Design a protein around this ligand. Structure first.
Ligand code: NAG
Ligand code: NAG
Ligand code: NAG
Length: 280
């Protein structure tokens, strides 16, 4: 929790909806009556609905760090950082400053960023003052050979374009190079290893079948044979102002297939899944 979403139709659209949002790519996850957007929810919700660990798509903001050989750099480490940023979720990483002669007071800052990137600093000073969530790193009472730590937190407001920026301690030539990359795309299972997926009449895209022309259904199971995909839906809805199969079933090649329940003695029946029995 929490995931706010509206009629999401792809894994990326789900990820973009907020850091609490995750996407279930499980084949047939959306049973009768359930639209594609049910695939997008908080991790605990999907788990509870039977989405397995390998089927929850949930890329996360993260930092990778690299240090050059030695000399290299002396005072700031690490020398290279790569961030993968999911919108709304901070990536955190630590920069160490090691005084050599100067200076007693040390500030940490970065070059101007686009409005899409928010950066704050925690300062873990040795004197031992602590600052948190500040626009700049700031430590007084810095001493030679006793390293100080700054925690850098970077948040993107969108799926950003790959860019770089630098972090520097004021008065020093040292550079921390920060590579910034988006983390918005899902790594989903494609249909390469099974020609029967989506009945071999559509493309599998993070659990959703995108059916070839002349085929409809969650699994592309229904050939239309030019009966319009409308005519077909018409025998699944009671009136033009009503919803298909009462919101409780799928229109499967012109006929409602109703949600089955594990609850005794619940039965959803009728031409449009309109009869909701509690005593069957
Ligand atoms: C998905 O459901 C369809 C029912 O139309 C079925 O043909 C297919 O075997 C199912 N695939 C799974 C569970 O992997
Ligand atoms: C950075 O260092 C601080 C202070 O030692 C520590 O509490 C924090 O967990 C570190 N942050 C990361 C991202 O490793
Ligand atoms: C009937 O209602 C559906 C519901 O969305 C709509 O797509 C369609 O425009 C309507 N058709 C006519 C001709 O009334």
């Amino acid at each position: 929790q929490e995931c706010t979403k509206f009629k999401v139709s792809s894994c990326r659209e789900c990820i973009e909806s907020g850091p609490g949002c995750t996407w279930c790519q499980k084949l047939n996850f959306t049973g009768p009556g359930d639209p594609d957007s049910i695939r997008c929810d908080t991790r605990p919700q999907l788990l509870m609905r039977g989405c397995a660990a390998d089927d929850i798509m949930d890329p996360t903001s993260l930092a990778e760090t690299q240090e050059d050989h030695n000399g290299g750099q002396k005072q700031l480490s690490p020398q290279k950082v790569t961030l993968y940023l999911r919108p709304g979720q901070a990536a955190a990483f630590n920069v160490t400053f090691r005084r050599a002669k100067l200076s007693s007071r040390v500030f940490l800052d970065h070059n101007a960023l686009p409005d899409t990137l928010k950066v704050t600093y925690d300062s873990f000073c040795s004197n031992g003052v602590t600052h948190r969530n500040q626009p700049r790193g700031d430590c007084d009472g810095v001493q030679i050979n006793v390293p100080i730590t700054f925690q850098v937190k970077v948040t993107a407001t969108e799926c950003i374009q790959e860019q770089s920026f630098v972090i520097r301690a004021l008065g020093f030539t040292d550079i921390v190079t920060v590579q910034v990359l988006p983390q918005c795309e899902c790594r989903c299972r494609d249909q390469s290893r099974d020609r029967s997926l989506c009945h071999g009449k559509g493309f599998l895209e993070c659990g959703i079948c995108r059916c070839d022309t002349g085929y409809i259904g969650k699994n592309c199971e229904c050939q239309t044979q030019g009966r319009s995909s409308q005519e077909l839906e018409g025998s699944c809805r009671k009136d033009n102002n009503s919803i298909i199969c009462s919101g409780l079933g799928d229109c499967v090649c012109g006929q409602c297939l109703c949600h089955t329940s594990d609850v005794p003695g619940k039965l959803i029946y009728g031409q449009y899944c309109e009869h909701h029995h509690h005593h069957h």
